[PDB]
Design an enzyme around this catalytic site. Sequence first.
Site, PDB file in Angstrom:
ATOM      1  N   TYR A  45      34.427 -17.178  -3.487  1.00 29.29           N
ATOM      2  CA  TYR A  45      34.297 -18.417  -4.259  1.00 29.29           C
ATOM      3  C   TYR A  45      33.963 -19.602  -3.328  1.00 29.29           C
ATOM      4  O   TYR A  45      34.212 -19.594  -2.093  1.00 29.29           O
ATOM      5  CB  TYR A  45      35.517 -18.797  -5.109  1.00 29.29           C
ATOM      6  N   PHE A  55      35.140 -29.796  -0.477  1.00 28.83           N
ATOM      7  CA  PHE A  55      34.438 -28.533  -0.719  1.00 28.83           C
ATOM      8  C   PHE A  55      35.154 -27.403   0.030  1.00 28.83           C
ATOM      9  O   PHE A  55      35.452 -27.615   1.212  1.00 28.83           O
ATOM     10  CB  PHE A  55      32.986 -28.627  -0.221  1.00 28.83           C
ATOM     11  N   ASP A  56      35.431 -26.260  -0.649  1.00 26.05           N
ATOM     12  CA  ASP A  56      36.264 -25.179  -0.151  1.00 26.05           C
ATOM     13  C   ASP A  56      35.591 -23.872  -0.474  1.00 26.05           C
ATOM     14  O   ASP A  56      35.078 -23.689  -1.568  1.00 26.05           O
ATOM     15  CB  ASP A  56      37.655 -25.191  -0.764  1.00 26.05           C
ATOM     16  N   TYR A 101      44.702 -29.668 -11.727  1.00 32.37           N
ATOM     17  CA  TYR A 101      45.821 -30.320 -11.068  1.00 32.37           C
ATOM     18  C   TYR A 101      46.407 -31.493 -11.881  1.00 32.37           C
ATOM     19  O   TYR A 101      47.296 -32.206 -11.445  1.00 32.37           O
ATOM     20  CB  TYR A 101      45.457 -30.697  -9.636  1.00 32.37           C
ATOM     21  N   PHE A 118      33.756 -24.483  -9.689  1.00 28.87           N
ATOM     22  CA  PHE A 118      33.685 -23.329  -8.826  1.00 28.87           C
ATOM     23  C   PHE A 118      32.470 -22.430  -9.132  1.00 28.87           C
ATOM     24  O   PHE A 118      32.128 -22.229 -10.310  1.00 28.87           O
ATOM     25  CB  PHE A 118      34.916 -22.495  -9.060  1.00 28.87           C
TER      26      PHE A 118
HETATM   27  C1  LIG Z   1      45.706 -27.487  -3.906  1.00 32.38           C
HETATM   28  O1  LIG Z   1      45.537 -26.912  -2.610  1.00 32.38           O
HETATM   29  C2  LIG Z   1      44.416 -26.155  -2.437  1.00 32.38           C
HETATM   30  C3  LIG Z   1      43.328 -26.107  -3.323  1.00 32.38           C
HETATM   31  C4  LIG Z   1      42.239 -25.314  -3.010  1.00 32.38           C
HETATM   32  C5  LIG Z   1      42.215 -24.616  -1.819  1.00 32.38           C
HETATM   33  C6  LIG Z   1      43.246 -24.749  -0.899  1.00 32.38           C
HETATM   34  C7  LIG Z   1      44.366 -25.493  -1.231  1.00 32.38           C
HETATM   35  O2  LIG Z   1      45.374 -25.632  -0.293  1.00 32.38           O
HETATM   36  C8  LIG Z   1      46.574 -24.876  -0.547  1.00 32.38           C
HETATM   37  O3  LIG Z   1      43.339 -24.152   0.343  1.00 32.38           O
HETATM   38  C9  LIG Z   1      42.630 -22.925   0.495  1.00 32.38           C
HETATM   39  C10 LIG Z   1      43.620 -21.784   0.549  1.00 32.38           C
HETATM   40  N1  LIG Z   1      44.437 -21.588  -0.637  1.00 32.38           N
HETATM   41  C11 LIG Z   1      44.069 -21.224  -1.876  1.00 32.38           C
HETATM   42  C12 LIG Z   1      45.217 -21.231  -2.615  1.00 32.38           C
HETATM   43  N2  LIG Z   1      46.210 -21.627  -1.806  1.00 32.38           N
HETATM   44  N3  LIG Z   1      45.740 -21.919  -0.604  1.00 32.38           N
HETATM   45  C13 LIG Z   1      45.438 -20.851  -4.038  1.00 32.38           C
HETATM   46  C14 LIG Z   1      46.213 -21.836  -4.914  1.00 32.38           C
HETATM   47  C15 LIG Z   1      45.606 -23.201  -5.037  1.00 32.38           C
HETATM   48  O4  LIG Z   1      44.185 -23.195  -5.404  1.00 32.38           O
HETATM   49  C16 LIG Z   1      43.855 -22.892  -6.663  1.00 32.38           C
HETATM   50  O5  LIG Z   1      44.612 -22.506  -7.490  1.00 32.38           O
HETATM   51  C17 LIG Z   1      42.348 -22.964  -6.865  1.00 32.38           C
HETATM   52  C18 LIG Z   1      41.822 -21.575  -7.287  1.00 32.38           C
HETATM   53  C19 LIG Z   1      41.741 -20.534  -6.204  1.00 32.38           C
HETATM   54  C20 LIG Z   1      40.922 -21.092  -5.037  1.00 32.38           C
HETATM   55  C21 LIG Z   1      41.464 -22.431  -4.531  1.00 32.38           C
HETATM   56  N4  LIG Z   1      41.678 -23.459  -5.643  1.00 32.38           N
HETATM   57  C22 LIG Z   1      41.521 -24.775  -5.380  1.00 32.38           C
HETATM   58  O6  LIG Z   1      41.953 -25.558  -6.183  1.00 32.38           O
HETATM   59  C23 LIG Z   1      41.056 -25.239  -3.975  1.00 32.38           C
HETATM   60  C24 LIG Z   1      40.384 -26.627  -4.071  1.00 32.38           C
HETATM   61  C25 LIG Z   1      40.032 -27.251  -2.747  1.00 32.38           C
HETATM   62  C26 LIG Z   1      39.423 -28.644  -2.918  1.00 32.38           C
HETATM   63  C27 LIG Z   1      38.098 -28.550  -3.647  1.00 32.38           C
HETATM   64  C28 LIG Z   1      38.337 -27.854  -4.963  1.00 32.38           C
HETATM   65  C29 LIG Z   1      39.084 -26.557  -4.887  1.00 32.38           C
END
Ligand SMILES: COc1cc2cc(c1OC)OCCn1cc(nn1)CCCOC(=O)[C@@H]1CCCCN1C(=O)[C@H]2C1CCCCC1
Length: 128
Positions: A45, A55-56, A101, A118
């Site tokens: 993803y 951007f991640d 969020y 995404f």
């Molecule tokens: C809110 O914090 C983060 C958000 C996101 C990535 C983050 C993160 O730091 C903790 O670090 C990458 C490693 N990672 C992924 C997750 N936990 N750590 C899953 C739970 C949280 O993420 C999510 O549920 C969703 C869906 C699965 C992929 C990651 N995700 C995100 O929300 C990403 C965001 C980063 C900023 C740009 C948008 C996406």
Amino acid sequence: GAPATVTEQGEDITSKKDRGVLKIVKRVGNGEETPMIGDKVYVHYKGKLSNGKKFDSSHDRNEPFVFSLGKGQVIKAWDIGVATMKKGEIAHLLIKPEYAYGSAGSLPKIPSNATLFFEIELLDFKGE
Ligand SMILES: COc1cc2cc(c1OC)OCCn1cc(nn1)CCCOC(=O)[C@@H]1CCCCN1C(=O)[C@H]2C1CCCCC1
């Protein structure tokens, strides 16, 4: 861009039909099965704020992102959206804050009331 295309063309895949999670299939996957709650899911993803300010990517670790579906290990929009995907499928999701969020955000990384985008590739899923 990709996000606008999802706003204009994207299927509303919420139960409530509140347009909180919009989806476009960008590459069709294989077979009929889509993952069930509890299944171990493997994806690649790329993700961003719709503001493009953050951007991640799983590509940034060259290794898949693994989670159990429907355990709320991820934002609600992913439990909802990855559940609709076939093995091999690539989809775009556009996500209102209520399914990401929310009003609280996840500061300093994610602001209040953030809309997320995404691109997701479903690599595989396997049973609990
Ligand atoms: C809110 O914090 C983060 C958000 C996101 C990535 C983050 C993160 O730091 C903790 O670090 C990458 C490693 N990672 C992924 C997750 N936990 N750590 C899953 C739970 C949280 O993420 C999510 O549920 C969703 C869906 C699965 C992929 C990651 N995700 C995100 O929300 C990403 C965001 C980063 C900023 C740009 C948008 C996406």
